Amino acid sequence: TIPHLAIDPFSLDFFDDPYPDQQTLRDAGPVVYLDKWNVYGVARYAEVHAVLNDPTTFCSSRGVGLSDFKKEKPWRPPSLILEADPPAHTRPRAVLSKVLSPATMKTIRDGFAAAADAKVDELLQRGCIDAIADLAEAYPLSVFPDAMGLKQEGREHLLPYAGLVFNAFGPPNELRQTAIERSAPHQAYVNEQCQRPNLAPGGFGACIHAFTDTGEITPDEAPLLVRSLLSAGLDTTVNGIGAAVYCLARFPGELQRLRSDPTLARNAFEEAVRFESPVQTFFRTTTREVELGGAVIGEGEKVLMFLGSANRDPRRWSDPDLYDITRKTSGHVGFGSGVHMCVGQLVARLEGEVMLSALARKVAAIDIDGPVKRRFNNTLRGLESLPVKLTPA
Ligand code: HEM
Numbered sequence: 001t002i003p004h005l006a007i008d009p010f011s012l013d014f015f016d017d018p019y020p021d022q023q024t025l026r027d028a029g030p031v032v033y034l035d036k037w038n039v040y041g042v043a044r045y046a047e048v049h050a051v052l053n054d055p056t057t058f059c060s061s062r063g064v065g066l067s068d069f070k071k072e073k074p075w076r077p078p079s080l081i082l083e084a085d086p087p088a089h090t091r092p093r094a095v096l097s098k099v100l101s102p103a104t105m106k107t108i109r110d111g112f113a114a115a116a117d118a119k120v121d122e123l124l125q126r127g128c129i130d131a132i133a134d135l136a137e138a139y140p141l142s143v144f145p146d147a148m149g150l151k152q153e154g155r156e157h158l159l160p161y162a163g164l165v166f167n168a169f170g171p172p173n174e175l176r177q178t179a180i181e182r183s184a185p186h187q188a189y190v191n192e193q194c195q196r197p198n199l200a201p202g203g204f205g206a207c208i209h210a211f212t213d214t215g216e217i218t219p220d221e222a223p224l225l226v227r228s229l230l231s232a233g234l235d236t237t238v239n240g241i242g243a244a245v246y247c248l249a250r251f252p253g254e255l256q257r258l259r260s261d262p263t264l265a266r267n268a269f270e271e272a273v274r275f276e277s278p279v280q281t282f283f284r285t286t287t288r289e290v291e292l293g294g295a296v297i298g299e300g301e302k303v304l305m306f307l308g309s310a311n312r313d314p315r316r317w318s319d320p321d322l323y324d325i326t327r328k329t330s331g332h333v334g335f336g337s338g339v340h341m342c343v344g345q346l347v348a349r350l351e352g353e354v355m356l357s358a359l360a361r362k363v364a365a366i367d368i369d370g371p372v373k374r375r376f377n378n379t380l381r382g383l384e385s386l387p388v389k390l391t392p393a
Protein backbone atom coordinates (compact mmCIF):
# COMPACT_ATOMS: atom_id res chain seq x y z
CA THR A 1 0.00 0.00 0.00
CA ILE A 2 2.77 2.46 0.90
CA PRO A 3 5.20 2.92 -2.02
CA HIS A 4 8.86 2.22 -1.30
CA LEU A 5 11.42 4.52 -2.88
CA ALA A 6 15.23 4.39 -3.05
CA ILE A 7 15.68 8.18 -3.21
CA ASP A 8 18.29 9.38 -0.72
CA PRO A 9 17.25 12.88 0.43
CA PHE A 10 20.64 13.30 2.12
CA SER A 11 22.79 12.55 -0.95
CA LEU A 12 24.86 15.17 -2.75
CA ASP A 13 22.93 14.62 -5.98
CA PHE A 14 19.68 15.36 -4.16
CA PHE A 15 21.09 18.53 -2.60
CA ASP A 16 22.38 19.66 -5.97
CA ASP A 17 18.85 19.65 -7.42
CA PRO A 18 16.08 18.29 -5.17
CA TYR A 19 13.12 19.43 -7.26
CA PRO A 20 12.59 16.41 -9.60
CA ASP A 21 12.98 13.94 -6.74
CA GLN A 22 10.57 16.01 -4.63
CA GLN A 23 7.96 15.75 -7.38
CA THR A 24 8.59 11.99 -7.51
CA LEU A 25 8.04 11.84 -3.72
CA ARG A 26 4.84 13.92 -3.86
CA ASP A 27 3.42 12.04 -6.81
CA ALA A 28 4.18 8.56 -5.45
CA GLY A 29 1.53 9.03 -2.73
CA PRO A 30 0.72 11.05 0.39
CA VAL A 31 3.06 8.81 2.47
CA VAL A 32 6.12 6.99 1.16
CA TYR A 33 8.69 4.69 2.72
CA LEU A 34 12.36 5.58 2.15
CA ASP A 35 14.22 2.27 2.05
CA LYS A 36 17.64 3.90 2.24
CA TRP A 37 17.07 5.03 5.84
CA ASN A 38 14.01 3.07 7.04
CA VAL A 39 11.82 6.13 7.56
CA TYR A 40 8.45 7.32 6.35
CA GLY A 41 8.37 10.43 4.18
CA VAL A 42 5.74 13.08 3.53
CA ALA A 43 6.35 15.56 0.73
CA ARG A 44 2.96 17.11 0.00
CA TYR A 45 1.80 20.28 1.71
CA ALA A 46 -1.27 18.65 3.29
CA GLU A 47 0.54 15.86 5.13
CA VAL A 48 3.50 18.04 6.14
CA HIS A 49 1.06 20.54 7.63
CA ALA A 50 -0.92 17.76 9.34
CA VAL A 51 2.18 16.20 10.91
CA LEU A 52 3.51 19.55 12.17
CA ASN A 53 0.12 20.33 13.74
CA ASP A 54 -0.26 17.03 15.65
CA PRO A 55 2.66 17.16 18.12
CA THR A 56 1.03 14.55 20.38
CA THR A 57 1.16 11.83 17.71
CA PHE A 58 4.25 13.16 15.90
CA CYS A 59 6.49 14.07 18.76
CA SER A 60 9.78 16.01 18.95
CA SER A 61 11.20 14.67 22.22
CA ARG A 62 12.64 11.58 20.47
CA GLY A 63 14.64 13.94 18.25
CA VAL A 64 13.95 15.91 15.07
CA GLY A 65 16.87 14.21 13.32
CA LEU A 66 17.05 10.66 12.02
CA SER A 67 18.34 9.44 15.40
CA ASP A 68 15.67 8.28 17.84
CA PHE A 69 16.62 9.38 21.38
CA LYS A 70 14.82 6.27 22.70
CA LYS A 71 17.43 4.17 20.84
CA GLU A 72 20.65 6.23 20.72
CA LYS A 73 22.28 8.89 22.87
CA PRO A 74 21.83 12.46 21.53
CA TRP A 75 25.10 13.95 20.28
CA ARG A 76 24.68 16.88 22.72
CA PRO A 77 22.22 17.39 25.63
CA PRO A 78 18.71 17.80 24.17
CA SER A 79 17.39 21.23 23.42
CA LEU A 80 14.80 22.29 26.02
CA ILE A 81 12.61 23.72 23.25
CA LEU A 82 13.18 22.02 19.87
CA GLU A 83 13.52 18.51 21.34
CA ALA A 84 10.75 18.82 23.94
CA ASP A 85 7.02 18.15 23.67
CA PRO A 86 4.20 19.89 25.52
CA PRO A 87 3.93 20.40 28.41
CA ALA A 88 7.73 20.46 28.99
CA HIS A 89 8.07 22.59 25.83
CA THR A 90 5.59 25.25 26.89
CA ARG A 91 7.40 27.37 29.46
CA PRO A 92 10.80 27.48 27.66
CA ARG A 93 8.92 28.39 24.49
CA ALA A 94 7.14 31.22 26.29
CA VAL A 95 10.48 32.61 27.51
CA LEU A 96 12.02 32.63 24.05
CA SER A 97 8.80 34.11 22.61
CA LYS A 98 9.05 37.00 25.07
CA VAL A 99 12.79 37.44 24.52
CA LEU A 100 12.22 37.65 20.72
CA SER A 101 8.80 39.31 21.06
CA PRO A 102 6.96 41.77 18.83
CA ALA A 103 7.82 44.38 21.43
CA THR A 104 11.58 43.47 21.47
CA MET A 105 11.95 44.07 17.70
CA LYS A 106 11.46 47.82 18.39
CA THR A 107 14.75 47.89 20.38
CA ILE A 108 16.89 46.42 17.58
CA ARG A 109 15.31 47.63 14.32
CA ASP A 110 17.17 50.96 14.01
CA GLY A 111 20.58 49.32 14.44
CA PHE A 112 19.77 46.37 12.18
CA ALA A 113 18.54 48.69 9.45
CA ALA A 114 21.55 51.01 9.75
CA ALA A 115 23.90 48.01 9.49
CA ALA A 116 22.10 46.74 6.39
CA ASP A 117 22.28 50.13 4.65
CA ALA A 118 25.95 50.43 5.62
CA LYS A 119 26.75 46.98 4.25
CA VAL A 120 25.08 47.69 0.92
CA ASP A 121 26.96 51.02 0.65
CA GLU A 122 30.24 49.24 1.35
CA LEU A 123 29.49 46.53 -1.22
CA LEU A 124 28.63 49.14 -3.85
CA GLN A 125 32.12 50.59 -3.46
CA ARG A 126 33.54 47.22 -4.54
CA GLY A 127 30.94 46.51 -7.23
CA CYS A 128 31.74 42.84 -7.76
CA ILE A 129 31.26 40.90 -4.54
CA ASP A 130 30.41 37.42 -3.28
CA ALA A 131 26.83 37.71 -2.05
CA ILE A 132 27.44 34.80 0.35
CA ALA A 133 30.65 35.68 2.24
CA ASP A 134 30.32 39.42 1.74
CA LEU A 135 26.57 39.86 2.30
CA ALA A 136 24.55 36.81 3.42
CA GLU A 137 27.22 35.88 6.00
CA ALA A 138 28.73 39.28 6.70
CA TYR A 139 25.46 41.05 7.50
CA PRO A 140 24.07 38.61 10.11
CA LEU A 141 27.57 38.34 11.60
CA SER A 142 27.52 42.14 11.91
CA VAL A 143 24.24 42.26 13.92
CA PHE A 144 23.25 38.93 15.50
CA PRO A 145 26.26 38.10 17.75
CA ASP A 146 26.07 41.65 19.06
CA ALA A 147 22.30 41.40 19.67
CA MET A 148 22.98 38.14 21.57
CA GLY A 149 25.55 39.96 23.72
CA LEU A 150 28.55 37.82 22.72
CA LYS A 151 32.11 39.06 23.09
CA GLN A 152 34.08 39.65 19.87
CA GLU A 153 36.63 36.87 20.45
CA GLY A 154 35.79 33.44 19.14
CA ARG A 155 32.88 34.39 16.88
CA GLU A 156 34.49 32.29 14.12
CA HIS A 157 33.07 29.26 15.99
CA LEU A 158 29.43 30.27 15.40
CA LEU A 159 28.86 29.28 11.76
CA PRO A 160 30.77 25.96 12.16
CA TYR A 161 28.72 25.16 15.27
CA ALA A 162 25.44 25.86 13.48
CA GLY A 163 26.50 23.84 10.42
CA LEU A 164 27.25 20.98 12.83
CA VAL A 165 23.83 21.24 14.49
CA PHE A 166 22.05 21.07 11.14
CA ASN A 167 24.27 18.29 9.77
CA ALA A 168 23.57 16.31 12.92
CA PHE A 169 19.84 16.07 12.18
CA GLY A 170 20.78 13.94 9.17
CA PRO A 171 21.59 10.29 8.95
CA PRO A 172 25.07 9.04 9.95
CA ASN A 173 26.53 9.85 6.54
CA GLU A 174 29.90 11.44 5.89
CA LEU A 175 28.56 14.99 6.29
CA ARG A 176 27.30 14.20 9.77
CA GLN A 177 30.20 12.10 10.94
CA THR A 178 32.83 14.61 9.79
CA ALA A 179 30.93 17.44 11.49
CA ILE A 180 30.85 15.59 14.80
CA GLU A 181 34.55 14.62 14.51
CA ARG A 182 35.45 18.31 14.28
CA SER A 183 32.97 19.56 16.89
CA ALA A 184 34.83 19.74 20.21
CA PRO A 185 36.27 23.29 19.99
CA HIS A 186 32.99 24.75 18.67
CA GLN A 187 30.94 23.05 21.40
CA ALA A 188 33.40 24.24 24.02
CA TYR A 189 33.18 27.84 22.87
CA VAL A 190 29.40 27.83 22.51
CA ASN A 191 28.72 26.19 25.85
CA GLU A 192 30.98 28.73 27.58
CA GLN A 193 29.27 31.79 26.03
CA CYS A 194 25.93 30.51 27.35
CA GLN A 195 26.87 31.21 30.97
CA ARG A 196 25.38 34.39 32.44
CA PRO A 197 28.64 36.33 33.08
CA ASN A 198 29.61 36.03 29.41
CA LEU A 199 26.50 37.70 27.95
CA ALA A 200 26.46 41.48 27.68
CA PRO A 201 23.68 43.46 29.40
CA GLY A 202 20.50 44.03 27.43
CA GLY A 203 21.19 41.38 24.75
CA PHE A 204 19.10 38.30 24.06
CA GLY A 205 21.28 36.03 26.24
CA ALA A 206 21.11 38.30 29.28
CA CYS A 207 17.37 38.59 28.76
CA ILE A 208 16.95 34.80 28.83
CA HIS A 209 18.91 34.67 32.10
CA ALA A 210 16.69 37.46 33.52
CA PHE A 211 13.61 35.24 33.07
CA THR A 212 15.00 32.74 35.58
CA ASP A 213 13.38 34.52 38.51
CA THR A 214 9.80 34.56 37.14
CA GLY A 215 9.23 30.88 37.61
CA GLU A 216 9.05 30.21 33.89
CA ILE A 217 12.56 28.70 33.75
CA THR A 218 15.18 27.99 36.37
CA PRO A 219 18.77 29.23 36.30
CA ASP A 220 20.06 25.84 35.08
CA GLU A 221 17.74 26.03 32.02
CA ALA A 222 18.98 29.41 30.81
CA PRO A 223 22.33 28.32 29.31
CA LEU A 224 20.66 25.70 27.11
CA LEU A 225 18.12 28.31 25.95
CA VAL A 226 20.97 30.65 24.99
CA ARG A 227 22.40 27.63 23.20
CA SER A 228 19.17 27.34 21.20
CA LEU A 229 19.54 30.87 19.80
CA LEU A 230 23.25 30.33 18.96
CA SER A 231 22.30 27.04 17.23
CA ALA A 232 19.24 28.13 15.29
CA GLY A 233 19.49 31.87 14.78
CA LEU A 234 22.53 32.60 12.57
CA ASP A 235 23.09 30.07 9.78
CA THR A 236 19.36 29.95 9.01
CA THR A 237 19.33 33.71 8.40
CA VAL A 238 22.51 33.49 6.30
CA ASN A 239 20.80 31.01 4.03
CA GLY A 240 17.54 33.00 4.00
CA ILE A 241 19.25 36.23 2.97
CA GLY A 242 21.42 34.36 0.47
CA ALA A 243 18.28 32.77 -0.94
CA ALA A 244 16.61 36.18 -1.33
CA VAL A 245 19.62 37.68 -3.13
CA TYR A 246 19.84 34.62 -5.36
CA CYS A 247 16.14 34.97 -6.22
CA LEU A 248 16.54 38.66 -7.07
CA ALA A 249 19.63 37.87 -9.16
CA ARG A 250 17.79 35.16 -11.13
CA PHE A 251 14.46 37.05 -11.46
CA PRO A 252 15.36 40.64 -12.43
CA GLY A 253 11.73 41.51 -13.09
CA GLU A 254 11.10 40.96 -9.41
CA LEU A 255 14.07 43.14 -8.44
CA GLN A 256 12.50 45.84 -10.60
CA ARG A 257 9.14 45.51 -8.83
CA LEU A 258 10.91 45.65 -5.47
CA ARG A 259 12.78 48.83 -6.43
CA SER A 260 9.55 50.41 -7.50
CA ASP A 261 7.90 49.63 -4.14
CA PRO A 262 10.41 48.98 -1.35
CA THR A 263 7.55 48.26 1.06
CA LEU A 264 7.40 44.85 -0.68
CA ALA A 265 10.72 44.00 1.04
CA ARG A 266 9.20 41.95 3.87
CA ASN A 267 7.05 39.88 1.49
CA ALA A 268 9.96 39.50 -0.98
CA PHE A 269 11.93 37.92 1.87
CA GLU A 270 9.02 35.72 2.96
CA GLU A 271 8.62 34.54 -0.65
CA ALA A 272 12.36 33.69 -0.75
CA VAL A 273 11.88 31.59 2.40
CA ARG A 274 9.02 29.72 0.69
CA PHE A 275 10.85 29.39 -2.64
CA GLU A 276 14.27 28.22 -1.41
CA SER A 277 13.31 26.97 2.10
CA PRO A 278 16.60 27.31 4.04
CA VAL A 279 15.46 24.52 6.33
CA GLN A 280 14.58 21.72 3.91
CA THR A 281 13.69 18.69 6.04
CA PHE A 282 13.47 17.34 9.53
CA PHE A 283 11.72 14.59 11.43
CA ARG A 284 9.09 13.61 13.97
CA THR A 285 8.66 10.24 15.72
CA THR A 286 5.25 8.58 16.06
CA THR A 287 4.03 7.94 19.62
CA ARG A 288 1.25 5.51 18.54
CA GLU A 289 0.01 3.76 15.47
CA VAL A 290 -1.53 6.45 13.24
CA GLU A 291 -3.40 6.81 9.94
CA LEU A 292 -1.97 9.61 7.82
CA GLY A 293 -3.27 10.31 4.32
CA GLY A 294 -4.75 6.81 4.21
CA ALA A 295 -1.58 4.97 5.27
CA VAL A 296 -1.04 3.21 8.61
CA ILE A 297 2.24 4.04 10.38
CA GLY A 298 3.29 2.09 13.45
CA GLU A 299 4.44 3.47 16.81
CA GLY A 300 8.04 4.56 17.22
CA GLU A 301 8.62 5.37 13.53
CA LYS A 302 10.56 8.31 12.14
CA VAL A 303 8.64 10.52 9.72
CA LEU A 304 10.67 12.80 7.43
CA MET A 305 8.93 15.99 6.36
CA PHE A 306 9.96 17.78 3.20
CA LEU A 307 9.29 21.45 3.98
CA GLY A 308 10.80 22.69 0.73
CA SER A 309 8.63 20.26 -1.22
CA ALA A 310 5.49 21.29 0.70
CA ASN A 311 6.36 24.88 -0.24
CA ARG A 312 6.44 23.88 -3.95
CA ASP A 313 3.44 21.53 -3.98
CA PRO A 314 1.10 22.50 -6.87
CA ARG A 315 -1.81 21.05 -4.87
CA ARG A 316 -1.41 24.07 -2.57
CA TRP A 317 0.37 26.79 -4.60
CA SER A 318 -0.30 28.42 -7.97
CA ASP A 319 2.85 28.47 -10.12
CA PRO A 320 4.85 27.11 -7.17
CA ASP A 321 8.13 27.25 -9.07
CA LEU A 322 7.90 30.98 -9.70
CA TYR A 323 9.39 33.60 -7.36
CA ASP A 324 6.60 36.18 -6.92
CA ILE A 325 7.16 39.00 -4.42
CA THR A 326 3.45 39.82 -4.23
CA ARG A 327 2.39 36.20 -3.62
CA LYS A 328 0.07 35.56 -0.69
CA THR A 329 2.70 33.63 1.26
CA SER A 330 0.72 32.99 4.46
CA GLY A 331 0.69 29.29 5.22
CA HIS A 332 4.06 28.39 3.82
CA VAL A 333 5.95 26.01 6.11
CA GLY A 334 9.47 27.47 5.74
CA PHE A 335 9.32 28.49 9.43
CA GLY A 336 7.36 25.38 10.39
CA SER A 337 3.78 25.40 11.68
CA GLY A 338 2.09 24.94 15.03
CA VAL A 339 3.59 24.84 18.48
CA HIS A 340 7.25 24.73 17.38
CA MET A 341 6.87 27.26 14.57
CA CYS A 342 10.10 29.25 14.50
CA VAL A 343 10.27 31.31 17.66
CA GLY A 344 12.92 33.50 15.98
CA GLN A 345 10.73 34.33 12.97
CA LEU A 346 10.50 38.04 13.85
CA VAL A 347 14.29 38.36 14.03
CA ALA A 348 14.68 36.51 10.71
CA ARG A 349 12.04 38.65 8.99
CA LEU A 350 13.55 41.85 10.42
CA GLU A 351 17.03 41.03 9.07
CA GLY A 352 15.65 39.96 5.70
CA GLU A 353 13.37 42.98 5.40
CA VAL A 354 15.99 45.58 6.19
CA MET A 355 18.55 44.01 3.85
CA LEU A 356 16.07 43.80 1.00
CA SER A 357 14.98 47.39 1.71
CA ALA A 358 18.60 48.55 1.44
CA LEU A 359 18.98 46.71 -1.88
CA ALA A 360 15.63 48.07 -3.11
CA ARG A 361 16.73 51.66 -2.42
CA LYS A 362 20.40 51.49 -3.43
CA VAL A 363 20.86 48.88 -6.17
CA ALA A 364 19.70 49.02 -9.79
CA ALA A 365 20.86 45.58 -10.92
CA ILE A 366 22.21 42.31 -9.50
CA ASP A 367 24.00 40.24 -12.15
CA ILE A 368 25.58 36.86 -11.51
CA ASP A 369 29.17 37.21 -12.76
CA GLY A 370 31.05 34.08 -11.68
CA PRO A 371 30.54 30.40 -10.89
CA VAL A 372 27.76 29.70 -8.41
CA LYS A 373 28.75 27.05 -5.85
CA ARG A 374 26.33 25.19 -3.61
CA ARG A 375 26.96 24.50 0.08
CA PHE A 376 26.00 20.99 1.23
CA ASN A 377 24.33 20.27 4.56
CA ASN A 378 21.98 17.46 5.64
CA THR A 379 19.10 19.82 6.36
CA LEU A 380 20.03 23.40 5.27
CA ARG A 381 19.81 24.56 1.62
CA GLY A 382 22.00 27.40 0.50
CA LEU A 383 24.97 28.56 -1.48
CA GLU A 384 28.70 28.58 -0.75
CA SER A 385 29.50 31.31 -3.29
CA LEU A 386 27.32 33.69 -5.32
CA PRO A 387 29.50 36.11 -7.35
CA VAL A 388 27.43 39.14 -8.34
CA LYS A 389 27.99 42.57 -9.77
CA LEU A 390 25.89 45.21 -7.97
CA THR A 391 25.09 48.29 -10.04
CA PRO A 392 24.22 51.41 -8.01
CA ALA A 393 20.84 53.06 -8.41
C1 HEM B 1 15.17 32.40 7.68
C2 HEM B 1 15.55 32.04 8.90
C3 HEM B 1 14.93 30.89 9.68
C4 HEM B 1 14.30 29.79 9.23
C5 HEM B 1 13.98 29.36 7.78
C6 HEM B 1 13.91 29.01 10.38
C7 HEM B 1 13.19 27.84 10.38
C8 HEM B 1 12.68 27.19 11.49
C9 HEM B 1 11.80 26.02 11.52
C10 HEM B 1 11.31 25.31 10.23
C11 HEM B 1 11.55 25.69 12.79
C12 HEM B 1 10.60 24.56 13.28
C13 HEM B 1 11.34 23.31 13.69
C14 HEM B 1 10.41 22.21 14.10
O1 HEM B 1 9.18 22.31 13.90
O2 HEM B 1 10.90 21.18 14.66
C15 HEM B 1 12.26 26.64 13.60
C16 HEM B 1 12.29 26.57 14.99
C17 HEM B 1 13.11 27.40 15.76
N1 HEM B 1 13.87 28.48 15.35
FE1 HEM B 1 14.01 29.15 13.44
N2 HEM B 1 14.30 29.66 11.51
C18 HEM B 1 14.95 30.79 11.14
C19 HEM B 1 15.51 31.78 11.95
C20 HEM B 1 15.60 31.71 13.32
C21 HEM B 1 16.18 32.73 14.16
C22 HEM B 1 16.73 34.09 13.70
C23 HEM B 1 16.17 32.22 15.42
C24 HEM B 1 16.58 32.83 16.76
C25 HEM B 1 17.02 34.07 16.94
C26 HEM B 1 15.56 30.91 15.41
C27 HEM B 1 15.31 30.09 16.47
C28 HEM B 1 14.51 28.98 16.46
C29 HEM B 1 14.19 28.14 17.59
C30 HEM B 1 14.76 28.34 19.02
C31 HEM B 1 13.34 27.18 17.18
C32 HEM B 1 12.69 26.09 18.03
C33 HEM B 1 11.24 26.57 18.33
C34 HEM B 1 10.47 25.51 19.11
O3 HEM B 1 10.87 24.32 19.15
O4 HEM B 1 9.37 25.84 19.69
N3 HEM B 1 15.18 30.63 14.10
N4 HEM B 1 12.97 27.55 12.80
Ligand SMILES: O=C(O)c1ccc(-c2ccco2)cc1
Binding pocket: 079, 080, 081, 082, 083, 165, 227, 228, 229, 231, 232, 279, 282
Ligand atom coordinates in the same frame (compact mmCIF):
# COMPACT_ATOMS: atom_id res chain seq x y z
O1 LIG C 1 17.03 24.60 20.22
C1 LIG C 1 17.97 24.48 19.37
O2 LIG C 1 19.14 24.17 19.66
C2 LIG C 1 17.51 24.50 17.93
C3 LIG C 1 16.26 25.02 17.57
C4 LIG C 1 15.81 24.94 16.27
C5 LIG C 1 16.65 24.38 15.32
C6 LIG C 1 16.04 24.19 13.97
C7 LIG C 1 15.96 22.94 13.34
C8 LIG C 1 15.17 23.20 12.16
C9 LIG C 1 14.85 24.54 12.27
O3 LIG C 1 15.37 25.09 13.36
C10 LIG C 1 17.88 23.86 15.66
C11 LIG C 1 18.34 23.96 16.96
Ligand SMILES: [Cl-]
Binding pocket: 076, 187, 188, 190, 191
Ligand atom coordinates in the same frame (compact mmCIF):
# COMPACT_ATOMS: atom_id res chain seq x y z
CL1 LIG D 1 27.04 22.14 22.40
Ligand SMILES: [Mg+2]
Binding pocket: 298, 299
Ligand atom coordinates in the same frame (compact mmCIF):
# COMPACT_ATOMS: atom_id res chain seq x y z
MG1 LIG E 1 6.23 -1.63 15.26
